[PDB]
Amino acid sequence: AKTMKKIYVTMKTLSPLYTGEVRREDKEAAQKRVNFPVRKTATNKVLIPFKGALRSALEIMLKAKGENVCDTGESRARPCGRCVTCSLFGSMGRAGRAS
RNA sequence: GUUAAAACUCUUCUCAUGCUGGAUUCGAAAUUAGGUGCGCUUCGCGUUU
Numbered sequence: 001a002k003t004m005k006k007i008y009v010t011m012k013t014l015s016p017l018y019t020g021e022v023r024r025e026d027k028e029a030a031q032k033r034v035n036f037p038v039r040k041t042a043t044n045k046v047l048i049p050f051k052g053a054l055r056s057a058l059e060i061m062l063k064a065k066g067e068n069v070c071d072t073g074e075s076r077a078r079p080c081g082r083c084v085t086c087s088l089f090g091s092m093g094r095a096g097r098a099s
Numbered sequence: 100g101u102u103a104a105a106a107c108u109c110u111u112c113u114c115a116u117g118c119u120g121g122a123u124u125c126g127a128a129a130u131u132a133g134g135u136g137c138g139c140u141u142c143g144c145g146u147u148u
């Protein structure tokens with residue numbers, strides 16, 4: 001609308017962290033060095049998915065609260081488009097407000 | 100057996116020139132490389148005063 005909420009999130013690891021590498025060429029290049037490479041950018045910086053953990057977190061607690069929420073984790077699921085997690089993170093036609 | 104018969108309105112000359120299917124609209128919306136696996140096994144801080 002007229003405003004936009006910018007939430008700057010700084011995350012500090014309180015234990016080891018592993019996000020696995022998704023790129024085929026980076027995994028096949030590292031297969032003789034490490035059997036579980038970490039997802040890194042090509043600027044040599046660690047890249048963690050953030051949308052999808054936020055969505056899973058909100059879906060589990062809003063399902064526990066009893067407020068209406070669909071499951072976008074079940075296989076080939078279709079987001080309902082009416083729940084609040086479909087508003088923030090997206091549905092098939094309305095898209096996520098929370099970029 | 101027609102004031103007859105006989106004599107091809109013929110030859111030559113490009114519908115050509117000038118004008119852009121252009122304008123408007125994002126392949127992107129939905130999907131966490133996740134799940135499983137204990138740096139463990141072996142070696143007395145001896146000896147020497």
Ligand SMILES: [Zn+2]
Pocket residue numbers: 069070079080081082083084085086
């Ligand atoms: Zn929904």
